[PDB]
Design an enzyme around this catalytic site. Structure first.
Site, mmCIF file in Angstrom:
data_model
loop_
_atom_site.group_PDB
_atom_site.id
_atom_site.type_symbol
_atom_site.label_atom_id
_atom_site.label_comp_id
_atom_site.label_asym_id
_atom_site.label_seq_id
_atom_site.Cartn_x
_atom_site.Cartn_y
_atom_site.Cartn_z
ATOM 1 C CG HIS A 197 61.866 40.346 -13.962
ATOM 2 N ND1 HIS A 197 62.521 39.456 -13.132
ATOM 3 C CD2 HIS A 197 61.087 41.148 -13.209
ATOM 4 C CE1 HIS A 197 62.084 39.714 -11.906
ATOM 5 N NE2 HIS A 197 61.232 40.735 -11.900
ATOM 6 N N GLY A 231 65.118 36.212 -5.293
ATOM 7 C CA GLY A 231 64.211 35.075 -5.394
ATOM 8 C C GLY A 231 62.796 35.383 -4.936
ATOM 9 C CB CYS A 291 60.796 38.512 -8.538
ATOM 10 S SG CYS A 291 62.181 39.643 -8.308
#
Ligand SMILES: C[C@H]1c2nncn2CCN1C(=O)C[C@@]1(C(=O)Nc2cncc3ccccc23)CCOc2ccc(Cl)cc21
Ligand SMILES: C[C@H]1c2nncn2CCN1C(=O)C[C@@]1(C(=O)Nc2cncc3ccccc23)CCOc2ccc(Cl)cc21
Ligand SMILES: [Cl-]
EC number: 3.4.19.12
Lengths: 302, 298
Positions: A41, A143, A145
């Site tokens: 993503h 942030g 991820c």
């Protein structure tokens, strides 16, 4: 003596954390040898997240669209491929800090350390467990991820989790390092919800054995139980069923303390019935379920 | 979202851990530049008398699979400083800092110079730490990281009969009225770190739990009169000032959060939890709460 929620030393993983930027999106990547692994993503914008066609979004990208930053050094992306929900960015430099590692997919109840990162920089380390509902109760902000979960076995890092999303209840969902999500989650902002969570019974029993090893026996009783009767009671408190595998796994701790597994089960049944009555077990007023039988043996013995 | 007991990333400290052996005693050492710091009890007491009988070659220092050669030795309070011929190429930017009770730090538990785990803990008001240490853990260190600088604040020396731990700063000064010898020693009556409980209540509010909030406020003196009854540390104006940022972010004045804490002390949680805990948690400082709820990196 003492019993703490203990994470693995994070050094071997810290030397793998990189920042991955694609357009306006910035997240973390795991740089092992000449490949940077990150959530797919990173190619999405917020609008794209409702129904993203990752194959369609990825085909429109070139290597130079991915900015990978390792410390104050920009790595050059020389290839890219998608494997399930993970993007694999081939880079022109092998990480000299690559530890001995393996990718392992864990089962619910298993624990692991999480090195929470923002902008490719490690911020903290904590201990987690894969909940029976396949979520993790992490501590992650925007942030985070791409932050990973791991265990260290001798000098080998077993990567087991990569962070992808936060569900509406504040719990977290992610994948193994092959990009397969844990649980029925998808990397889409479609209405998703964690299933009803349950307590990891085998872990609570492991923790009761840790308490006995450290000198606390107040909760023990003169009773035993059949496995089926234990499970009938356990389910009423939203506890996971205890299987014969769990009973076998608790064998070593049962032998070390001299308390049979079904005898510890009877103690757990009584704790579920009575509560703790102002008492604590290993400094906790709740029954702790994020220590596995393996963690207890490691922390109490070596 | 989420709130965990979070330790600093331990990598900068892992590259400093070495094994120190003297005779039959093996423990951990901290190798910074050309000096290895370790508990002076590795020579075990009249420490000056025991130390004068030792030569450099009696100390076996092992950094990974490499034996370091000791070229000098000196004692500073309860820490032995072993001068080695090789400066640690992995020496981070560091300082030795002495912390105050209530302050938290990360502990990198080690055995035979090898890091085994990292956990977060607080210096209790009774100067002990509720650590998790086994035999061989001596010399394991406590630290904080600020930007890229490791502030070493604790070195493990011993376990007290109640299972709690005692140690020194890196200059070898014990925290608490403890001494490094096999003798009758006991931790004093501990108290709860009030400013930390309030910081954790603010963390709970930031994480969406407000059930414990109330319309009431209190005076600092009235709060302290109640807090003293429940073995809580006195809350000072410094603590109130330190909680200012969290008070502004959540809109709950510090004395308003104190009234919530007073009601929690007098009535309990009533089957409810706060951040997954049925007890009032006191091992997160106001700075730890801000750092975790803002994502500060190192
Ligand atoms: C990287 C991030 C991004 N950044 N700028 C553009 N995008 C678009 C892609 N991003 C996301 O959508 C990430 C996101 C997500 O869950 N992010 C977060 C993760 N952990 C903790 C968080 C705490 C607070 C807020 C967000 C958090 C946001 C919500 O919806 C979903 C749904 C499915 C998935 Cl797989 C991911 C997400
Ligand atoms: C290193 C150890 C040694 N090993 N072989 C020879 N020696 C001689 C010196 N040693 C000690 O005596 C260490 C000791 C101590 O407290 N060690 C321990 C630390 N942390 C956790 C522990 C858990 C279980 C058992 C021991 C533990 C043992 C008890 O009494 C004291 C009293 C004063 C001091 Cl400063 C230290 C100690
Ligand atoms: Cl597993």
């Amino acid at each position: 003596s003492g019993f703490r929620k203990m994470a693995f030393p994070s050094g071997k993983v810290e030397g793998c954390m990189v920042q991955v930027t694609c357009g306006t999106t910035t997240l973390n990547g795991l740089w092992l040898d000449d490949v940077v692994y990150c959530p797919r993503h990173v190619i999405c914008t917020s609008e794209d997240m409702l129904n993203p066609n990752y194959e369609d979004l990825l085909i429109r990208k070139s290597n130079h669209n991915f900015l990978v930053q390792a410390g104050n050094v920009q790595l050059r992306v020389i290839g890219h491929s998608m494997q399930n929900c993970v993007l694999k960015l081939k880079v022109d430099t092998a990480n000299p800090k690559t530890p001995k590692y393996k990718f392992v997919r864990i089962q619910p109840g298993q624990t692991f350390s999480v090195l929470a990162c923002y902008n490719g920089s490690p911020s903290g380390v904590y201990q987690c467990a894969m909940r029976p509902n396949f979520t993790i109760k992490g501590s992650f902000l925007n942030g985070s991820c791409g932050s990973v979960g791991f265990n260290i076995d001798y000098d080998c890092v077993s990567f087991c989790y990569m962070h992808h999303m936060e569900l509406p209840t504040g719990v977290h969902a992610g994948t193994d390092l092959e990009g397969n999500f844990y649980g029925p989650f998808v990397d889409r902002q479609t209405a998703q919800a964690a299933g009803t969570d349950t307590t990891i019974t085998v872990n609570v029993l492991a923790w009761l054995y840790a308490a006995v090893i450290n000198g606390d026996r107040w909760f023990l009783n003169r009773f035993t139980t059949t496995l089926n009767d234990f499970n009938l009671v356990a389910m009423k408190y939203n506890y996971e069923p205890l299987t014969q595998d769990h009973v076998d796994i608790l064998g070593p701790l049962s032998a070390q303390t001299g308390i049979a597994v079904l005898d510890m089960c009877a103690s757990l049944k009584e704790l579920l019935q009575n509560g703790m009555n102002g008492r604590t077990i290993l400094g906790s007023a709740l029954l702790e379920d994020e220590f596995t039988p393996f963690d207890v043996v490691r922390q109490c013995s070596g």
